[PDB]
Amino acid sequence: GVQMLLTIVGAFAAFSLMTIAVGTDYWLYSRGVCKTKSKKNEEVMTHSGLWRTCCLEGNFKGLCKQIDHFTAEYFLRAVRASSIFPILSVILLFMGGLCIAASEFYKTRHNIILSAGIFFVSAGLSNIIGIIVYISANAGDSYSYGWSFYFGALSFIIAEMVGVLAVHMFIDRHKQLRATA
Amino acid sequence: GVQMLLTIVGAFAAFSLMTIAVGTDYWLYSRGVCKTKSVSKNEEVMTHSGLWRTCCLEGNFKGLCKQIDHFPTAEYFLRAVRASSIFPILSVILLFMGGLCIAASEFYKTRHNIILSAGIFFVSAGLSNIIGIIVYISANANSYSYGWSFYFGALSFIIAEMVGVLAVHMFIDRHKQLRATA
Amino acid sequence: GVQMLLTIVGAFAAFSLMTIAVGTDYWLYSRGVCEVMTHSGLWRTCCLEGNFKGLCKQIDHFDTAEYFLRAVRASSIFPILSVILLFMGGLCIAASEFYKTRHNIILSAGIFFVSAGLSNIIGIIVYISANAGDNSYSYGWSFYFGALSFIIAEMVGVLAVHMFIDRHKQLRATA
Amino acid sequence: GVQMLLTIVGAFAAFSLMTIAVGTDYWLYSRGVCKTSKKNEEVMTHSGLWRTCCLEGNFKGLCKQIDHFPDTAEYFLRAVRASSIFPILSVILLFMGGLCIAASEFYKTRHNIILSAGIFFVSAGLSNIIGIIVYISANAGDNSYSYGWSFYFGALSFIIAEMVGVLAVHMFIDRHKQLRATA
Amino acid sequence: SKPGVFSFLDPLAYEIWMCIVFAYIGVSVVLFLVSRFSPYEWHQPPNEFGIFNSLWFSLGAFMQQGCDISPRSLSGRIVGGVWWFFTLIIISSYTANLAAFLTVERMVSSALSLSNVAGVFYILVGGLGLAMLVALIEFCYKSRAEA
Amino acid sequence: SKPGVFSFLDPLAYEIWMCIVFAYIGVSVVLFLVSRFSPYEWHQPPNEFGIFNSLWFSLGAFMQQGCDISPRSLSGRIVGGVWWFFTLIIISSYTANLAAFLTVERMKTSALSLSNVAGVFYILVGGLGLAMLVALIEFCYKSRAEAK
Amino acid sequence: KSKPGVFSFLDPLAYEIWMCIVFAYIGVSVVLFLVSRFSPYEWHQPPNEFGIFNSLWFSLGAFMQQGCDISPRSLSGRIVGGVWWFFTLIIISSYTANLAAFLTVERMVSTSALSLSNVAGVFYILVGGLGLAMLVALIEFCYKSRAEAKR
Amino acid sequence: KSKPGVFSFLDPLAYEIWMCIVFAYIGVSVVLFLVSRFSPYEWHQPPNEFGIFNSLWFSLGAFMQQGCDISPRSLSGRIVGGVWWFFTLIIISSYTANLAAFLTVERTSALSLSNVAGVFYILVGGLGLAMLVALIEFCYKSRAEAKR
Numbered sequence A: 001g002v003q004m005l006l007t008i009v010g011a012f013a014a015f016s017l018m019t020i021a022v023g024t025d026y027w028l029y030s031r032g033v034c035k036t037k038s039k040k041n042e043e044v045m046t047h048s049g050l051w052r053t054c055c056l057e058g059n060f061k062g063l064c065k066q067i068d069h070f071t072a073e074y075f076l077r078a079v080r081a082s083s084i085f086p087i088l089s090v091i092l093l094f095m096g097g098l099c100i101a102a103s104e105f106y107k108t109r110h111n112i113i114l115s116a117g118i119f120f121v122s123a124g125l126s127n128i129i130g131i132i133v134y135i136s137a138n139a140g141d142s143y144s145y146g147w148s149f150y151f152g153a154l155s156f157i158i159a160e161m162v163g164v165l166a167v168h169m170f171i172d173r174h175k176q177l178r179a180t181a
Numbered sequence B: 001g002v003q004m005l006l007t008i009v010g011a012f013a014a015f016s017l018m019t020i021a022v023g024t025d026y027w028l029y030s031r032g033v034c035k036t037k038s039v040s041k042n043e044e045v046m047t048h049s050g051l052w053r054t055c056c057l058e059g060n061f062k063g064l065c066k067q068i069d070h071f072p073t074a075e076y077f078l079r080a081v082r083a084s085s086i087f088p089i090l091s092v093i094l095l096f097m098g099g100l101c102i103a104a105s106e107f108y109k110t111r112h113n114i115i116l117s118a119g120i121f122f123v124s125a126g127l128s129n130i131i132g133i134i135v136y137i138s139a140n141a142n143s144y145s146y147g148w149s150f151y152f153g154a155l156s157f158i159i160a161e162m163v164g165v166l167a168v169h170m171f172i173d174r175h176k177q178l179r180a181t182a
Numbered sequence C: 001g002v003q004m005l006l007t008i009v010g011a012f013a014a015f016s017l018m019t020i021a022v023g024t025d026y027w028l029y030s031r032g033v034c035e036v037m038t039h040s041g042l043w044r045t046c047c048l049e050g051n052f053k054g055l056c057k058q059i060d061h062f063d064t065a066e067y068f069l070r071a072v073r074a075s076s077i078f079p080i081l082s083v084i085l086l087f088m089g090g091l092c093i094a095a096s097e098f099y100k101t102r103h104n105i106i107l108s109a110g111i112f113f114v115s116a117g118l119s120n121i122i123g124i125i126v127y128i129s130a131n132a133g134d135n136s137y138s139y140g141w142s143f144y145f146g147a148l149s150f151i152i153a154e155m156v157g158v159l160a161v162h163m164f165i166d167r168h169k170q171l172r173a174t175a
Numbered sequence D: 001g002v003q004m005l006l007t008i009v010g011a012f013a014a015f016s017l018m019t020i021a022v023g024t025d026y027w028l029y030s031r032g033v034c035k036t037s038k039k040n041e042e043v044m045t046h047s048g049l050w051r052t053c054c055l056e057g058n059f060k061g062l063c064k065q066i067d068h069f070p071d072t073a074e075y076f077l078r079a080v081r082a083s084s085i086f087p088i089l090s091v092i093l094l095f096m097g098g099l100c101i102a103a104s105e106f107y108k109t110r111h112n113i114i115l116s117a118g119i120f121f122v123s124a125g126l127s128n129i130i131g132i133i134v135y136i137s138a139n140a141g142d143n144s145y146s147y148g149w150s151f152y153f154g155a156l157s158f159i160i161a162e163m164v165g166v167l168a169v170h171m172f173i174d175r176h177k178q179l180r181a182t183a
Numbered sequence E: 001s002k003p004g005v006f007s008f009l010d011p012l013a014y015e016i017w018m019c020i021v022f023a024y025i026g027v028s029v030v031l032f033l034v035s036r037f038s039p040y041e042w043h044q045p046p047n048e049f050g051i052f053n054s055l056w057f058s059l060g061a062f063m064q065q066g067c068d069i070s071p072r073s074l075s076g077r078i079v080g081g082v083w084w085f086f087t088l089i090i091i092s093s094y095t096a097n098l099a100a101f102l103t104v105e106r107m108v109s110s111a112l113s114l115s116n117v118a119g120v121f122y123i124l125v126g127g128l129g130l131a132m133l134v135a136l137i138e139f140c141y142k143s144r145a146e147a
Numbered sequence F: 001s002k003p004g005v006f007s008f009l010d011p012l013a014y015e016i017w018m019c020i021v022f023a024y025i026g027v028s029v030v031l032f033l034v035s036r037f038s039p040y041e042w043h044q045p046p047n048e049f050g051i052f053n054s055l056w057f058s059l060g061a062f063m064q065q066g067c068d069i070s071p072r073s074l075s076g077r078i079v080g081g082v083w084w085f086f087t088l089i090i091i092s093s094y095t096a097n098l099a100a101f102l103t104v105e106r107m108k109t110s111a112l113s114l115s116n117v118a119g120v121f122y123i124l125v126g127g128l129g130l131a132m133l134v135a136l137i138e139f140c141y142k143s144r145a146e147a148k
Numbered sequence G: 001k002s003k004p005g006v007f008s009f010l011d012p013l014a015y016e017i018w019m020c021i022v023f024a025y026i027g028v029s030v031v032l033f034l035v036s037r038f039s040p041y042e043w044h045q046p047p048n049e050f051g052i053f054n055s056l057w058f059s060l061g062a063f064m065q066q067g068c069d070i071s072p073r074s075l076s077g078r079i080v081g082g083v084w085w086f087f088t089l090i091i092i093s094s095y096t097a098n099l100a101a102f103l104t105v106e107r108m109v110s111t112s113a114l115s116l117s118n119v120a121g122v123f124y125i126l127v128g129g130l131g132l133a134m135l136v137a138l139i140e141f142c143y144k145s146r147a148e149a150k151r
Numbered sequence H: 001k002s003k004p005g006v007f008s009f010l011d012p013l014a015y016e017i018w019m020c021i022v023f024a025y026i027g028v029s030v031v032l033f034l035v036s037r038f039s040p041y042e043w044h045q046p047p048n049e050f051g052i053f054n055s056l057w058f059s060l061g062a063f064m065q066q067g068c069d070i071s072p073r074s075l076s077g078r079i080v081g082g083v084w085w086f087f088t089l090i091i092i093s094s095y096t097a098n099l100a101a102f103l104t105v106e107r108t109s110a111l112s113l114s115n116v117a118g119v120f121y122i123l124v125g126g127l128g129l130a131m132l133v134a135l136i137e138f139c140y141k142s143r144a145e146a147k148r
Ligand SMILES: CCCCCCCC/C=C/CCCCCCCC(=O)OC[C@H](O)CO
Pocket: F074, F077, F078, F080, F081, F082, F085, H007, H053, H056, H057, H060, H122
């Protein structure tokens, strides 16, 4: 059905975008250092990401380092470092996709669709917390966001929309059943 | 009945309390002078004032009242509206015409449109009172306090509005009986 | 019909008011030079007082946001778009007589009038955001004429849509 | 019944937690003198409603009596936080509500005893709020101050009293619905 | 220096607070009059704005709380409109004068404490005890009457 | 030190009131139009949004109050959705600016007085006068015309 | 740096007021419940919809200015909504007017837009409340489902 | 000299607080939809009017402080409604309070049209979109009917 195609296509997109966001280094465009700790100190335009930063110009152009991420202050810092939420969003979208995959091979199990709905909606919710934790921490420690930030931001919308679409399929399953009698 | 009793009592009370207020001079307990044409020192005493006169209360020159100097283009209008006290005086007129309506309502019976007149007059009288209080407060604006005269108008307001609802209720009930005979 | 009559009249009134406004040089009463009081307009500034009395002069209309607003005002599209859309509403009302069957013509008139008012309310927000962008100023008859065209256009717009709503209504009744 | 068992337990719980609150001396944890010639005092003290005893110092456990009269109109507060009638009126009301509930399970048919309990619990919780506000609004008049477990018992007692009040009304409603059913 | 109990009534003057009760009483009597005086409207009441549901509309309007009845007559739809503008200007003048009180008290050369809002809490617990009195009294009457 | 009767309008400039009144007519001749122009929704009207119930909803929204009617179509929720924003921004500006007008007493902080907001009553009590003049002309008409 | 706290949106009002709003909201919701439904002379079927649950909701809505659908229709139940609408009015006005005193006085020290960090605690509560709503709704679905399966 | 901008009514709250009010509006709405109509047991005609499109309108009227015609009547749905009315409250207060700080201390005259000239555009634009959305449906519904 057309709804399943949009759900499958939308599930793929939401998942691909988020994994790209978590695996790319274009979350922010700030001024900073690209060289390591070790001189000729100099602040250079850097395109930092969720994990590693990268030099955008100069003689170290493209050299990429590891963000030295480091009490409620520490809690947020730890959450942001590990980035559990931007990965838990990836995880939930993948789990949601298996449920849609499983649905075709278990037509009598309607619950398996609801699970995809909940997974997708929960995935979007984790992504919001990832965004907030990212920014909130990003400010505690001039700047413009890159595409990776907007890939995860777009992933939120797609996941919510696919979650809505998945919930509607669940209702339709039960709705047809009820009509039979 | 019981209804017309409450209305007639209320209508009379609102008229009395709003003729005393206009006619007495205990509206505002300020601190000023009640004398004039000072010969050739500056001394202001406590003087209860009203709509028409300022009267001393302490020291010498006691009792002595002096017509308030009302006029001593937005402010021109305010002084004129406050120097004539139309709104406080309009309220006595309306509350009186409302009384005439309740009286007539007995002789010229089966003319319900005289109870509605009564109710509207009483409601309009309350609305005049609000403006005459705002104008009064706005115009007069050390320490100052408000006296009984002021709390009579402010009480003549409620009593009137309440007589207004009673007179509207009587008009409703009158017409409802007509819708019930048929 | 009474409603059809209060539309033609209202439409011609709105169109007349706007056409006068867009061209009469009496929009703003400020102090400048063609420094003496002047009766500015939408295209020309004329010296109202003192010497050279009545001499006129084309207005000097000159981030990219600043430029943008300056241009849309310099060209006065919105006041003149409103002059265009009111004319089309007028034509549709006139053509509505020729074709009693087709009722989409009055609805077109309705949309034109309503949308024409929206072109005024935008020409009154670019002419106020820019005269201040570059006091004792005061607004004038030509201005209010414009504003009055809006009101008459929304009202005529309601009349047009009511005529439509009623025309389709009678069709339903027959059935 | 189940709805009654909770009411008995809830009445008892509310009354117990308020009596302990009014008696214990760990309402507030502030800095003050635990003793009636400059005295290097200012030692950490824990105060209740009538007694203030320091937590540390050479006077490990020495207590004292709060002085609540140390010019007009405001006085009325100093005299409502000195008799502490609102905390004490809340104890009395909760006790009276328990009597009603207990009397209810005996007489029966009366139905209006179960309601009375409902009015004696909801009002008890309402006297408690006023006592809480009066407490806080009096200390402010007189700042690391922290609250102890006697304050949080009087706060928890309020919650249990309102819930028993709902429960007692819900039993009154149910008694009357049973009457209407037989009708 | 400790604030007064009924201090939350100080941004607006007494004269405003007293004229806000005379306007409330005068908008509800006008709301009711126009709503029900006409016998050509009754066909069962025309609306619901009696003397009591109009005192609730005016109060609900003032406290920025959506009412459960809206006037549908032309006359009644004017009393409601001039009482939504009044409310708007008056409620935006307490919040904007309170923010002027609180500001100039800081820059003299801190969060609000219960001392500042002691009054609202009292009034509240005094209207909850007044409601239980006005509800248990009626209950006594209706019960003593059935006897 | 000499406040005006209508000094309650100072926060916003004159042109922001000449345009809150042109936006209110606009958003009402659009709400009505989009709600009732269509003949494929009628049967009895579709919704309670004529040209009078629209001019109310808009004067209900701008006053932060509510009306029993609420747009139910996509075309009607857009209108009602952008006028619920053009309200939040303005009703807030008016406050946030009035707080500026009262903090910096440009020519310590005194209480507001009746003379500052006197107009807010001359108008109310004028709308209670107009309301009674509109209610009675009806009664005066509906009575005589029917009695005839 | 002076990094603002997570739960800093609650600065304007002291900790006492906040605790006392929760206590003055539980009371208003019990008294409303009582004054409305305790009297059986009104019942004919409940006379009002103000059950304890629908009272904890009217009182909540009222506080957040957000209007609701139910509204008291008795003299008693109206003295509980009238003093609660006035309480609500002063408290919300005193939060906005003290948050506007802080933000100003700080602007006079010697850009300025509020930053997510300032009010990041109102997003955590939101996404947390959203997830509790999706838990309260499934433990109900699950529950009801098991019953249907056994029977 | 700093001329006011067009979309300067969005200054009090920063960029990341206007993007996250859109990510939270789409989050509340979806969640409200789900918790209300996912249960097959409550169904039967739906139990509540909180479909997806009616959940995007409830969550919008809440944020704009206006009222809607539906209030959730379930525990699940009433939690979403309550954590969103609290969010809304803190954010609409933080805008009025920050705006006041922006107008009180300039780092105080009547607010000028330019200062809000941007809201009035979004209004007209919304009104314009509204009419398009309406006439497109009409056009479609018109031909498709004659084609029958
Ligand atoms: C069916 C449910 C309802 C759906 C319909 C809801 C109403 C549509 C408008 C929403 C908010 C109002 C418009 C918000 C405009 C924000 C500002 C803007 O357009 O952009 C600013 C610009 O980015 C600066 O650089």
